[PDB]
């Protein structure tokens, strides 16, 4: 029967003022929120943000929309949401957001006989995440999603996570290649501004970065250039053009790896963990060329001393670099 329901929904919307919240002038309307995370597409260090797609569900009771003659939950067409009051929910840390609109606007209105409204939205959000990159790329990051009411204070609207800690699902659905979700938390606050106190819900994730891309991308190229600079120690000191060119090209390659590394990072004034490894690897390849420049300086007058320094450098340079990697990888892991 569709004629009686059409008379029922027209009865609910006749005299309905969208400008007024439920229980206007009375106790605040409680809005319960659920988030079904679809994906986290990007996590950008340069822009310090992340792109999140989710199903955002809001639950509240509107006694103007209570019906009696139907024992079913009325799922209506999504264009009825323009004729209803909805909460003014926005994301505080959101840089850029949008509701999906193919094939229709990705929203859902489900009514209940007591007036409970289920309002779902499919939203893709690029939210800001300020990142501490002092231990990059062996760092843990905490990226949040701050959910707030825009104009209604706590006297008019109260937020809560509907379901407690089970209010956010789909955290296992997140597949980032360079990240893994360690933990997610749900925080409920009240935030006081100059215009009043506002209800706040927070969804935060702990992101642990995977080291496997950076070992291949930077660490292992920087190790092999440092081993390449030790090849000069086994070459005879008369080969001046051969040992200087080994010292030149290993020093210049470390400069091209450092510059390439900077491009993938924001313009931070401090030093990251991969910067400490490249500056440590630059010292080893610079002292390998300075070792020949001391050998070339003395191999005419003192040929036995210069042959001793070449023999000394064949075992001290791999030992100090293994000691450098031992202090480095036990400090950051």
């Amino acid at each position, epitope marked *: 029967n569709m004629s009686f329901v059409k008379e029922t929904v027209d009865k609910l919307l006749k005299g309905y003022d969208i400008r007024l919240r439920p229980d206007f002038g009375g106790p605040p309307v409680c809005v319960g929120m659920n988030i*079904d995370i679809a994906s986290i597409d990007m996590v950008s260090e340069v822009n310090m943000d992340y792109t999140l797609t989710m199903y955002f569900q809001q639950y509240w009771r509107d006694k103007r929309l209570a019906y009696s003659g139907i024992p079913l939950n009325l799922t209506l067409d999504n264009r009825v949401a323009d004729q209803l009051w909805v909460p003014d929910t926005y994301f505080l840390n959101d840089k850029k957001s949008f509701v999906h609109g193919v094939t229709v606007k990705n929203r859902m209105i489900r009514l209940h006989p007591d007036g409970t409204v289920l309002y779902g939205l499919r939203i893709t959000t690029t939210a800001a995440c300020m990142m501490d990159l002092r231990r990059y790329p062996l760092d843990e990051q905490n990226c949040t999603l701050e959910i707030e009411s825009y104009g209604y204070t706590t006297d008019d609207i109260e937020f809560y996570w509907r379901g407690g800690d089970k209010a956010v*699902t789909g*955290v*296992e*659905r*997140i*597949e980032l290649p360079q990240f*893994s*979700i360690v933990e997610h938390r749900l925080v409920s606050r009240n935030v006081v501004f100059a215009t009043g106190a506002y209800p706040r819900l927070s969804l935060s994730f702990r992101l642990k970065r995977n080291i496997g891309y950076f070992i291949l991308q930077t660490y292992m190229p920087s190790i092999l250039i440092t081993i390449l600079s030790w090849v000069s120690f086994w070459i005879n000191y008369d080969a001046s053009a051969a040992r200087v060119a080994l010292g030149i090209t290993t020093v210049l390659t470390m400069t091209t790896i450092n510059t390439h590394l900077r491009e993938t990072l924001p313009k931070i004034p401090y030093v990251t963990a991969i910067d400490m490894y490249l500056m440590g690897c630059f010292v080893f390849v610079f002292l390998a060329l300075l070792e020949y420049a001391f050998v070339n300086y003395i191999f005419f007058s003192q040929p036995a001393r210069a042959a001793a320094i070449d023999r000394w450098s064949r075992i001290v340079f791999p030992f100090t670099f293994s000691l450098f990697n031992l202090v480095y990888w036990l400090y950051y892991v």
Partner: nanobody
Amino acid sequence: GSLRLSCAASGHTFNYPIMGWFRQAPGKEREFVGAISWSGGSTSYADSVKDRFTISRDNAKNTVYLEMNNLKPEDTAVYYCAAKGRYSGGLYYPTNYDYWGQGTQVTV
């Protein structure tokens, strides 16, 4: 006591990144125990087995293990192991899971 089960997978495990543990008591519904992702390791558990059961995996053997510690007589069911596709929704619902295990009868 503490018991450890172990579910081994083989085949196209990339399109099915989520493994789930289910149990079916005789005369009752198939109940969600816990779930585990292959890549990563983000776990989920039911309330009746939380802080007693631990699930983790190794991607080398393609093996998912369900460690059942602090056993109870309400844990007497055929324990199933199931795989779930990527764009299937809801860990708790066994209809979303495609490939199932055989199911061993466990009675404490």
